[PDB]
């Protein structure tokens, strides 16, 4: 079982002896600091509140196990067994903490308060920063959702430019990162953060997380189609690649099917196997069940252009109303090797320069989508900004001399609409003056209970693009 007593950085165990004497309150906030990723999607906190923070999280056994571990870990007795016993006996193991947060799915510019944490009992002044480590891991669902939405921005721009509309935009970036992430739990969290912006996923674990912690009107959060891998092609033997292709397309004749075609020679497969030997099987296919040719190797842009050029000469190409070339509706393409936000931009721009519509293509991303991201990318940070000591509050901050980018905000914080409809974070309790209207943070957690929640449908609506609205 999970033990929140053992779910923190080791040094935090010793933090209670470091605060000034008579500290009654510790108040802290989370932000994506300014340093392009100018705006972030807030998503993932609700998962953490339910899975790890709500309910009876303290028991006598959990106190005892933390005791025994920390005695040997530090080779000394520094564990605050008294304060954890106080929480057990006084609150039946419920955390005396208040967390206020911007609604999930909201798109907020960099450098604004996203959530705040404070203790609701003077005796638990140390508890605020104890749970810093758990809460800061929200950087990851925030960064996946933000990085995924930025790629959707690129995709929407070139789809609209080459086709005249945004049809099928939500299926243009498909999650292929299950194997490429660091764990099963990461796969679920990251796939759900992708599904805030798109509908296509192969990481099954995201669907379960969404249903369990957020919910949707529809039965399934994400969708997928039948597809081949190298083992199901190569197992037929090198000389029988055509037999594998024919068997697979026939097996899924009425639904869309993706067939990786680069096992030996991608160019030969598109020109000779799909384009000649098996062309009859492809042309008969329905509009709703196209053959999706997937290259998996080589330079991502060079491969897509040569693949499209080959198919354009074996298959009937039309020109759409914007003047961009279109494969017949039974034939499409997916590029799922080496796709990240940077190469995605290079591919669609190169496709447009060669007059190919983005309608022809979808993208799969693995490591780029879920694994190649860090807390440093959006500068996610958690800092103390206000404490009460001897009954007097003081506005608290850091201001390192060698880096003004690491300066932290001062005092009690609030998030507001500006008169022009933008966002601003008010410092030093100044939101109490009511010059900017109402604080947009809501209490989402108080004294062990989740007090406000959002369905995954609300989050998706919140996270939409302007071009979509």
Ligand X SMILES: Cc1ccc(-n2cc3c(N4CCC[C@H](C(=O)NCc5ccc6sccc6c5)C4)ncnc3n2)cc1F
Ligand Y SMILES: NC(=O)c1cccnc1
Residues 232-291 that bind ligand X (CB under 6 A): 256, 258, 290
Binding mask 46-65 for a second copy (x = CB under 8 A): ------x-------------
3-state secondary structure of 206: helix
Judged by CB under 6 A, does residue 336 bind ligand Y? yes
Among residues 445, 447, 451, 444, which one has the least CA distance to residue 93?
447
Interaction with ligand Y in 202-261: which residues (CB under 6 A)? Answer: 202, 227, 258
Judged by CB under 8 A, does residue 131 bind a second copy? no
Judged by CB under 6 A, does residue 390 bind ligand Y? no
Task: Out of 62, 149, 157, 174, point to the residue binding ligand X (CB under 6 A).
Answer: 174
Please, where are the H alpha helices in 408-455? none
Residue 296 marked ligand-binding = yes
Judged by CB under 8 A, does residue 82 bind a second copy? no
The listed partner (ligand X, ligand Y, Cl ion, none) that binds 9, CB under 5 to 8 Å by sort, is: ligand Y
Indicate if the alpha-carbon torsion angle 352, 357, 360, 366 is positive or negative.
positive
The listed partner (ligand X, a second copy, Cl ion, none) that binds 447, CB under 5 to 8 Å by sort, is: none
# chain residues binding ligand X, by CB under 6 A: 16
Buried b or exposed e, range 19-39, using 16+ CB within 10 angstroms: eeeebbbbbbbbbbbeeeeeb
Binding mask 43-82 for Cl ion (x = CB under 5 A): ----------------xx----------------------
* Contacts (Cβ under 8 Å, ≥6 apart) of 237: none
Judged by CB under 6 A, does residue 344 bind ligand X? no
Among residues 201, 228, 381, which one has the least CA distance to residue 295?
228
Residue 78 near residue 13, CB atoms below 8 Å: yes
> H or E segment at 226?
none
* Contacts (Cβ under 8 Å, ≥6 apart) of 336: 174, 176, 294, 296, 363, 364, 365, 366
Task: Out of 160, 166, 225, 388, point to the residue binding ligand X (CB under 6 A).
Answer: 225
Judged by CB under 8 A, does residue 84 bind a second copy? no
Interaction with ligand X in 363-422: which residues (CB under 6 A)? Answer: 364
The rounded distance, in Å, linking the Cα atoms of 142 and 164 is 31
3-state secondary structure 237-299: CHHHHHHHHHHHHHHCCCCCEEEECCCCCHHHHHHHHHHHHCHHHHHCCCCCCCEEEECCCCC
Interaction with ligand Y in 187-206: which residues (CB under 6 A)? Answer: 202
Judged by CB under 8 A, does residue 40 bind a second copy? no
DSSP 83-113: HHHHHHHHHTT---EEEEEPPTT-EEETTSE
Task: Out of 2, 9, 34, 56, point to the residue binding ligand Y (CB under 6 A).
Answer: 9
In the complex with a second copy, which residue's Cβ is closer, 230 or 313?
230
Residue 110 marked ligand-binding = no
User: Which residues partner with 443 through β-bridges?
Assistant: 100
Judged by CB under 6 A, does residue 167 bind ligand X? yes
Q: Which stretch binds a second copy (CB under 8 A): 75-83, 94-102, 105-113, 453-461?
A: 75-83
The listed partner (a second copy, Cl ion, ligand Y, none) that binds 387, CB under 5 to 8 Å by sort, is: a second copy
Among residues 52, 64, 66, which one has the least CA distance to residue 6?
66
Residue 294 marked ligand-binding = yes
Interrupted after residues, the chain (C–N over 2.5 Å): 35
Contacts to Cl ion by CB under 5 A: 59-60
Contacts to ligand Y by CB under 6 A: 9, 11, 176, 202, 227, 258, 336, 364, 366
Contacts to ligand X by CB under 6 A: 167-168, 171-172, 174, 200, 225, 256, 258, 290, 292, 332, 334, 361-362, 364
């Amino acid at each position: 079982e999970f033990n929140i007593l053992l779910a923190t950085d080791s040094y935090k165990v010793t933090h209670y002896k470091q605060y000034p004497p008579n500290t009654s309150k510790v108040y802290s906030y989370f932000e994506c600091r300014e340093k392009k990723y100018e705006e972030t999607v807030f998503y993932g906190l609700q998962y953490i509140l339910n899975k790890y923070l709500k309910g009876k999280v303290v028991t006598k056994e959990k106190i005892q196990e933390a005791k025994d571990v920390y005695k040997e870990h530090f080779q000394d007795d520094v564990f605050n067994e008294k304060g954890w016993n106080y929480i057990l006996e006084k609150y039946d193991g419920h955390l005396p903490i208040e967390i206020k947060a911007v609604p999930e799915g909201f798109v907020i510019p960099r450098g604004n308060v996203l959530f705040t944490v404070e203790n609701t009992d003077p005796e638990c002044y140390w508890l605020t920063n104890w749970i810093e480590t758990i809460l800061v891991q929200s950087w990851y669902p925030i960064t996946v959702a933000t990085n995924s939405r930025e790629q959707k921005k690129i995709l929407a721009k070139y789809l609209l430019e080459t086709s005249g509309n945004l049809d099928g935009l939500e299926y243009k970036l498909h999650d292929f990162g299950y194997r490429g992430v660091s764990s099963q739990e990461t796969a679920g969290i990251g796939a759900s953060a992708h599904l805030v912006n798109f509908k296509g996923t192969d990481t099954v674990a995201g669907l379960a997380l969404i249903k369990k912690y957020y919910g949707t009107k529809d039965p399934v959060p994400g969708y997928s189609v039948p597809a081949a891998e190298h083992s199901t092609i190569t197992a037929w033997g090198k000389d029988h690649e055509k037999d594998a292709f024919e068997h697979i397309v026939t097996q899924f004749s009425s639904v869309p099917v993706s067939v990786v075609s680069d096992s030996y020679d991608i160019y030969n497969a598109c020109e000779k196997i799909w384009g000649e030997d098996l062309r009859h099987l492809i042309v008969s296919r329905s509009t709703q069940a196209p053959l999706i040719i997937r290259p998996d190797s080589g330079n991502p842009l060079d491969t897509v252009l040569k693949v499209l050029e080959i198919l354009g000469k074996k298959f009937p190409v039309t020109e759409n109303s914007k003047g961009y070339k279109l494969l017949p509706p039974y034939l499409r393409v997916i590029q799922g090797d080496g796709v990240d936000i940077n190469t995605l931009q290079e591919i669609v721009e190169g496709m447009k320069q060669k007059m190919w519509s983005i309608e022809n293509i979808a993208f799969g991303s693995g490591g780029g989508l879920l694994q190649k991201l860090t807390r440093d990318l959006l500068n996610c940070s958690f800092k103390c900004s206000y404490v009460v000591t001897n009954g007097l509050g003081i506005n608290v901050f850091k201001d390192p001399v060698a880096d003004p980018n690491k300066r932290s905000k001062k005092g009690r914080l609030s998030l507001h609409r500006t008169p022009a409809g933008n966002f601003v974070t008010l410092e030093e309790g100044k939101g109490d003056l009511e010059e900017y209207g109402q604080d947009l943070l809501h209490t989402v957690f108080k004294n062990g209970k989740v007090t406000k929640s959002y369905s995954f449908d609300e989050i998706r609506k919140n996270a939409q693009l302007n071009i979509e609205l």
